[PDB]
Amino acid sequence: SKIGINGFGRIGRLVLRAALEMGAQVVAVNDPFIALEYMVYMFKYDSTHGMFKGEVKAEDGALVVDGKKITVFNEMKPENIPWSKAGAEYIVESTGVFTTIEKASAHFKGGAKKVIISAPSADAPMFVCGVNLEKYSKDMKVVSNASCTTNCLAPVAKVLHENFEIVEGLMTTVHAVTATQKTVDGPSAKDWRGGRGAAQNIIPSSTGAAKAVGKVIPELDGKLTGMAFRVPTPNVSVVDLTVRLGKECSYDDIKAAMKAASEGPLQGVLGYTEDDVVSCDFTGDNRSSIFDAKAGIQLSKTFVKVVSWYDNEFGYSQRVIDLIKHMQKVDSA
Amino acid sequence: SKIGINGFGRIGRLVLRAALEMGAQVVAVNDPFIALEYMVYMFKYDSTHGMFKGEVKAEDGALVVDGKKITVFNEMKPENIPWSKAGAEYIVESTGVFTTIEKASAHFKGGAKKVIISAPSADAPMFVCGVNLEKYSKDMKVVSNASCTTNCLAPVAKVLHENFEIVEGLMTTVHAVTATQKTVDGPSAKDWRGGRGAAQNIIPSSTGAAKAVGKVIPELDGKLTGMAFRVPTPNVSVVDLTVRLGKECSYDDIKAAMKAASEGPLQGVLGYTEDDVVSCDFTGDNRSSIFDAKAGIQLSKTFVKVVSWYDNEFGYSQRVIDLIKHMQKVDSA
Amino acid sequence: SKIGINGFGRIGRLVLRAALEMGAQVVAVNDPFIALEYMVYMFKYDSTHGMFKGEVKAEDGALVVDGKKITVFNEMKPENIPWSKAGAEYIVESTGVFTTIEKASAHFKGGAKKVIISAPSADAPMFVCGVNLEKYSKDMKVVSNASCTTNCLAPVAKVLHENFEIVEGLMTTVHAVTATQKTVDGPSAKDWRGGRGAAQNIIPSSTGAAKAVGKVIPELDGKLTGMAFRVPTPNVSVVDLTVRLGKECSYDDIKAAMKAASEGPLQGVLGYTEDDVVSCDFTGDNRSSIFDAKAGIQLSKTFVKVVSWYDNEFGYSQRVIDLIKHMQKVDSA
Amino acid sequence: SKIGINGFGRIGRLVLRAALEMGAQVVAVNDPFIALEYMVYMFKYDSTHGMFKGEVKAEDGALVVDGKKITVFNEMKPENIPWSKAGAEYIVESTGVFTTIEKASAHFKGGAKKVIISAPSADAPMFVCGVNLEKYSKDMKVVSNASCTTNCLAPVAKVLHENFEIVEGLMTTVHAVTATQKTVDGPSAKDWRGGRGAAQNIIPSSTGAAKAVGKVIPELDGKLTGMAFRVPTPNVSVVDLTVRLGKECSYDDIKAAMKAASEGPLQGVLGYTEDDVVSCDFTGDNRSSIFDAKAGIQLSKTFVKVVSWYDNEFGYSQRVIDLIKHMQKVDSA
Numbered sequence A, B, C, D: 001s002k003i004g005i006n007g008f009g010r011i012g013r014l015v016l017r018a019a020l021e022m023g024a025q026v027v028a029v030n031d032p033f034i035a036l037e038y039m040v041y042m043f044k045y046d047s048t049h050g051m052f053k054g055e056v057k058a059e060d061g062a063l064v065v066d067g068k069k070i071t072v073f074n075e076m077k078p079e080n081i082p083w084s085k086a087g088a089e090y091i092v093e094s095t096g097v098f099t100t101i102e103k104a105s106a107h108f109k110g111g112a113k114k115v116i117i118s119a120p121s122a123d124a125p126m127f128v129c130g131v132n133l134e135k136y137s138k139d140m141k142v143v144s145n146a147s148c149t150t151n152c153l154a155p156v157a158k159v160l161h162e163n164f165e166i167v168e169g170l171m172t173t174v175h176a177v178t179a180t181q182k183t184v185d186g187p188s189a190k191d192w193r194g195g196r197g198a199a200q201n202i203i204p205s206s207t208g209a210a211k212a213v214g215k216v217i218p219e220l221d222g223k224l225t226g227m228a229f230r231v232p233t234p235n236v237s238v239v240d241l242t243v244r245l246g247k248e249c250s251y252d253d254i255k256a257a258m259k260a261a262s263e264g265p266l267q268g269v270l271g272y273t274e275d276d277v278v279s280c281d282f283t284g285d286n287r288s289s290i291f292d293a294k295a296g297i298q299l300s301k302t303f304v305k306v307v308s309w310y311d312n313e314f315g316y317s318q319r320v321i322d323l324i325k326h327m328q329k330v331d332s333a
């Protein structure tokens, strides 16, 4: 598998726990801001997901996790990371900075084959597991696994559109805090509301996720837009989609369509519950999107509100592994 | 004014504060679970709204606030409260337990003239200041001031319906925690999700608010429904309204309509802002509904999402005093 | 083992997860406020400790957890719970109400052998695993496993006293919120600070734990007292003990004494770390007390501050199982 | 007054607010990361302290607050700030980065007369209002106002030492989060515990505060040390001081001593309360230290625990203005 990770942040580390869980193989990590002994500590301890159970240690300038030796690097510039020298073919680009094709192409200066951007890219091919993986051709060098909200929205939008046709829809995501937020009111020059104290506030925010679903499911291009509210919870978010449908249906037809899709073509991407769940019930959940049957409401036969949960750090990290496995199996077909 | 308050909770205490602010006169309070010396403390200290600036003391069995003596009762049964001894005529019923005309009518036994339920009532006429006060008549003995979410939604729905016609709408309220929630996972038999730990969770919840706007604005009956997400913040909530409109418009038309109504017929009830606000900016705000111009989004000429903030404790408490002042003017003209 | 539980609250449920983890056997549960289908939900979902992995279902009026059928009851009065009819010999008394010998003796009216109170008792024998289990005689019918803070304090106090002698000490516990607290300012007539909004505040509180250590380790009777600060975190607390010692020592002698005790006589009760830990690192931790080596400070050779972590719901629930196993093995010796 | 502020952060903005409240005159502000139109917004809205009641606007390249024009600079290097163009003489240095006399001396290049570091300095004389202002002399060019915790601890240590003699003491501060903490687990290389998610954790931390009281009250040098626990609240902290005393006393003697000092030599700096207060009761409090009479405990005649509250942002900011007013009186008498 020969995966390398650039950025050992929330995503970077959990992509490694995902890899180990799914038997994938990471062979190199890079982060300027985190020296190897600090990498041990950050990998081992996690406030949201719990301590890594298994051995993590620094041994001979390498990070060794459960026997797996992983070569470390602390390069500030992507051009200077020796991927070739570690044996890393498939690079996961987790920094939140080399997101355009141009920028992620710096990983070619060190011998990387393919770059998977772990965020929406301005111009790299965006994929969402369960929804558009067949669009992936072997000549695609720099791809994107899109955002965490797009991976929750696009499964649910695919089922609603295929069965009842989405004429238009507006989305809100009630979203957990992230690392770009501030503990107390401080400077966020590009997003003034985003700098206000994260634990004190409900914070309106923008999201490009609904619009990006028009790239992943081309039929919906231009039919979806939305916004976010950031609220004080450490992880797990929820999509609230209000949709105008082309075909008359009951809410029970929407629940049966979600249940059938989660048992077959979207098995493991889309889950389904009828339980009285709340957001802590999905911490550690592996799926991209979990349809909450009892929280949605239907106003009329064509106007309805659907609720889908997602663990924004964890399900996404497992999908990064899934996109890699598929890319390899296609390129090694 | 001769107002009496039954239930000295978040709403009961802040109605006293609003009354003192607006020069209204409370002459008696009743609460079985709060003894006079404890009422001093609870009124004096408020974790969300600050310490009361003024003298508060227990003197001769009364609560004395800035010189005014308030008779205190601690009667469990409404029919047993001697409202006539204190001279209390207009009774704010804020226990949350006597919300029907049958149950609220117990106050009449004690000599009360009028009862104002500080919650939706299944049968007492519901009022929202700035929207339907013209329907109140002096023979109405028991009235309701509806809920805090209906007082936010109904102003904004009035402006949109009058200018562009609401064909149908679905509402979400992202709502601060309340007193019925639990600090840790505990038993809430009639609402399982509502018993999960309030500080840890985004909790889906039901709201009658959008249905109740159909009773306040009769032409919207059956065209609106919605739900709540309870999130970990101590006060201030936001209504997210997705609406399908009868007339084509731009978002600038919606903003100009809201600005014009906050300057005229709805001044003091609906506010307007174009700043980068977050929920802590509305703590202590007196208005029922503050339209956030920059957070809404319009997908097409007839489908848009509108965001309005409300301090669910404080703005509602000022409206209770406003409704009472309107009623006494009608009952004495 | 034939354990029964009265009160399926935070402790009641986690004592059952502890039992299942440790192969103990629970055969009956009682709680008026929780009907069997709601018991399934509360056992299955836990905001702090995660979903029970394994099957939980209601089957023939019994709760069935991983194959174990458990007889349910919903008695409001302890005298009316048929322990005899379920086969429950050893009762765990988790309600927070039948804490005196008198009150816990109501479980004899239904055929219970022994009662383990899961809180400090005013007069039942208090035990702390690793510290005074040899004081337990077979004739003791109603015992107490003391408080969660006493189970964290007494291990650490036992090591400091045995090695250096505690002349006097003062304790603070920075303690996570509990179920007796309120989401927003509400009535707590017996503890006015305890009613103020739990997520908004640092709340001074009393604790009897330091004083109770004088009952568990008689030599320290009268030498320890302390207080609590309740802070907004859902679980895991920390003891901050400032102690005046009889013998001159360095801080490294205190760390070596804690490490030796955790490897031998207090193995599994007292743990030891030198890592840069924070409270989420101990969620799910099984030990009663985890000495934090790097956070303590020594001012002089006889005056020092020691920091010990504890998961107040979880380690305590496992110790309830441990006290039961020891009681049985002594009574079945 | 002719005050200039360098760094327009929590402390920089609240010193402007304190100055306007106390009729002091700020004539210039400098901050490289905050443009003039963004400074309007950040000063106008405050999630902890409320919206500024007054007009705030950007006019002709200046910040105009209630009529007063303030020249704005956005210089990264202190030696480059044209303080003399604006007429700024007394410079509040609140960036947190130029805390030594060498580094703070950069302001002299621009024409500043005096610099007040709003933090502990390794070498500038440290002052605490009400405790050692008498030591300031007009030849002192760079002074420090110490930290917020030293300003809480030093009043209370002064009263105890003067009346009962402190033999030795260990301090804990349970402290609100600050701007150096992280919303989720992220990199803090020089302080690993400090990078763990601030909203989820009780985080042990170091504090120089108790050592620094030894420099402010020379007779306490080497007799006090302590630590911090950072807990999830946005403002207001509490000092928990365990002290061994030279003279035998009762707790009523300690309370009477504190009451007497808050009425005389320390009025306005040390407050006193006997109510059931919690941290939200001190948001916006002007005092440096509020002795909580009911929360302290005395184990014996010479060993006791004292609790004092402080609004770490607001009371400290008023003391910055107080220190400056004292200095100008000495520099012009």
Ligand SMILES: NC(=O)c1ccc[n+]([C@@H]2O[C@H](COP(=O)([O-])OP(=O)(O)OC[C@H]3O[C@@H](n4cnc5c(N)ncnc54)[C@H](O)[C@@H]3O)[C@@H](O)[C@H]2O)c1
Residues within 6 Å of the ligand: A006, A007, A008, A009, A010, A011, A012, A030, A031, A032, A033, A034, A075, A076, A077, A094, A095, A096, A097, A118, A119, A147, A148, A178, A179, A312, A313, A316, D185, D186, D187
């Ligand atoms: N947080 C989530 O829920 C989530 C979900 C989906 C996608 N993402 C995306 O993943 C990306 C990373 O987000 P995160 O939440 O893990 O953030 P983070 O702040 O936890 O991680 C960023 C990491 O990149 C490192 N870094 C910075 N510069 C570097 C460089 N020049 N080279 C290599 N490493 C460097 C930082 O030190 C840090 O460890 C972002 O684009 C984010 O939008 C995050």
Ligand SMILES: NC(=O)c1ccc[n+]([C@@H]2O[C@H](COP(=O)([O-])OP(=O)(O)OC[C@H]3O[C@@H](n4cnc5c(N)ncnc54)[C@H](O)[C@@H]3O)[C@@H](O)[C@H]2O)c1
Residues within 6 Å of the ligand: B006, B007, B008, B009, B010, B011, B012, B030, B031, B032, B033, B034, B075, B076, B077, B094, B095, B096, B097, B118, B119, B147, B148, B178, B179, B312, B313, B316, C185, C186, C187
């Ligand atoms: N909290 C808000 O934001 C909000 C907003 C609008 C309306 N309301 C409504 O106002 C009502 C009260 O809500 P709250 O938030 O003040 O709750 P709360 O729990 O803070 O207050 C309820 C109070 O009534 C008292 N009480 C109970 N039984 C009584 C009795 N039998 N007789 C007299 N007093 C008694 C309680 O001791 C308590 O002080 C509810 O119907 C609620 O839905 C609340």
Ligand SMILES: NC(=O)c1ccc[n+]([C@@H]2O[C@H](COP(=O)([O-])OP(=O)(O)OC[C@H]3O[C@@H](n4cnc5c(N)ncnc54)[C@H](O)[C@@H]3O)[C@@H](O)[C@H]2O)c1
Residues within 6 Å of the ligand: B185, B186, B187, C006, C007, C008, C009, C010, C011, C012, C030, C031, C032, C033, C034, C075, C076, C077, C094, C095, C096, C097, C118, C119, C147, C148, C178, C179, C312, C313, C316
């Ligand atoms: N929460 C902790 O961290 C912790 C730690 C140590 C000890 N304890 C103690 O354990 C006891 C229970 O605490 P908890 O935190 O689990 O509280 P909780 O509120 O979660 O549980 C109390 C339970 O008792 C039930 N109950 C009430 N009356 C009953 C009755 N008459 N008969 C049977 N069941 C009834 C309630 O419905 C509830 O489920 C308390 O004494 C508490 O001090 C708690």
Ligand SMILES: NC(=O)c1ccc[n+]([C@@H]2O[C@H](COP(=O)([O-])OP(=O)(O)OC[C@H]3O[C@@H](n4cnc5c(N)ncnc54)[C@H](O)[C@@H]3O)[C@@H](O)[C@H]2O)c1
Residues within 6 Å of the ligand: A185, A186, A187, D006, D007, D008, D009, D010, D011, D012, D030, D031, D032, D033, D034, D075, D076, D077, D094, D095, D096, D097, D118, D119, D147, D148, D178, D179, D312, D313, D316
């Ligand atoms: N927050 C409190 O409770 C508190 C209390 C007492 C003292 N302090 C101290 O005050 C100082 C500032 O703390 P804060 O809480 O205001 O933090 P903050 O992060 O809110 O503010 C620091 C400000 O200085 C600015 N800045 C950074 N580099 C600059 C530069 N080179 N030139 C000019 N301005 C620059 C930043 O943009 C920011 O606005 C620190 O030393 C802190 O320890 C804080």
